[PDB]
Design a protein around this nucleic acid. Structure first.
Lengths: 98, 94
DNA sequence: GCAGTGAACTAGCTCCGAAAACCTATAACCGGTTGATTTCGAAGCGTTTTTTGAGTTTTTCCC
C-alpha cells in the first residue's frame, strides 16, 4: 500500500524537507483532518474529493454466515465524496478489477 | 461552518509554525498529489487509525440523462472509495 | 598603493555525537459472507466556491 512513511520519503526526495520533520508534518495534517471531522466540522476539498458526515437511519442487518438479523442503529459516520477531477484521474488503469 | 484546504493551510501553519509556511503548503499539496497519483496507478492507500482509502470498479452500463433521458453508453471504470479507521470512526462518533 | 592584520584554508586523523538505517510484534486493516434500508450516480449547463496562481506590502526575524 501507499504509506505515510512513503509520503515522508517522497517529501524528503521531492521537496528536500528532512524526513524527521516531514513525518510530523504529514501526521499533523492527518491529525487535524481528524480533529475537523471529530468536531463534525465538514471538511471540504477541491482538486480532491471531500469529507462529509452522514446520519444513517435505522437499517436491517444480519449475520451473513448464519442468516440471523440484527438491527443497525442510526449513527453518524464519515463519508467521503470523490471529486470529478479525482475520478477523471482514477477512471482507467491497468487491466484488472479492484 | 466547514473546513477547507485553504483553511487547513493556515491552521497547520499555526500549530506547526516552526516549519516554513510554504514548506507546509508545498508539502501538503504534494502529498495530496501523491495519494491521488497512487490511486490513479491502481494502488491501495492504507494507514493505521485513520483507516484505508482504496479503489472500486463499475461495469459498463446503459445509463442516460436525468435532464433529457437520452440513452448514454458507458464503459467500465474505477472510482475511489474510503473506509474510516476505527480510531477516526470513534472520534467522529459522538 | 602601501604596511598591517585577521579570516579562509590546508590532511588526515582518531575520537566522539548524532541521525540514519534496520528488525520486531501486532493492532488496525483485508477478505469473505446477507439483504432491506439508504446512499450514490448516468449529462451537462449555470451558480458558487475554492485554491491555485500572482503580485507584493507589510511584518517579522536575525544579525
Amino acid at each position: 500500500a501507499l504509506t505515510k512513511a512513503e509520503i515522508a520519503e517522497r517529501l524528503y526526495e521531492e521537496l528536500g524537507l528532512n524526513k524527521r520533520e516531514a513525518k510530523e508534518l504529514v501526521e499533523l495534517f492527518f491529525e487535524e483532518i481528524r480533529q475537523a471531522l471529530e468536531h463534525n466540522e465538514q471538511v471540504k476539498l477541491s482538486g480532491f474529493g471531500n469529507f462529509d458526515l452522514r446520519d444513517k437511519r435505522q437499517r436491517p442487518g444480519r449475520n451473513p454466515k448464519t442468516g440471523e438479523e440484527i438491527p443497525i442503529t442510526a449513527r453518524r459516520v464519515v463519508t467521503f465524496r470523490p471529486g470529478q477531477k479525482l475520478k477523471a484521474r482514477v477512471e482507467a488503469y491497468a487491466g484488472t478489477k479492484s | 461552518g466547514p473546513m477547507t484546504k485553504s483553511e487547513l493551510i493556515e491552521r497547520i501553519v499555526t500549530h506547526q509554525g516552526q516549519l516554513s509556511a510554504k514548506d507546509v503548503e508545498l508539502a501538503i499539496k504534494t502529498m495530496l498529489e501523491q495519494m491521488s497519483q497512487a490511486l490513479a496507478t491502481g494502488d491501495r492507500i492504507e494507514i493505521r487509525g485513520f483507516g484505508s482509502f482504496s479503489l472500486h470498479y463499475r461495469a459498463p452500463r446503459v445509463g442516460r440523462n436525468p435532464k433529457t433521458g437520452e440513452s448514454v453508453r458507458l464503459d467500465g471504470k474505477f472510482v475511489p472509495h474510503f473506509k474510516p479507521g476505527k480510531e477516526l470512526r470513534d472520534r467522529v462518533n459522538e
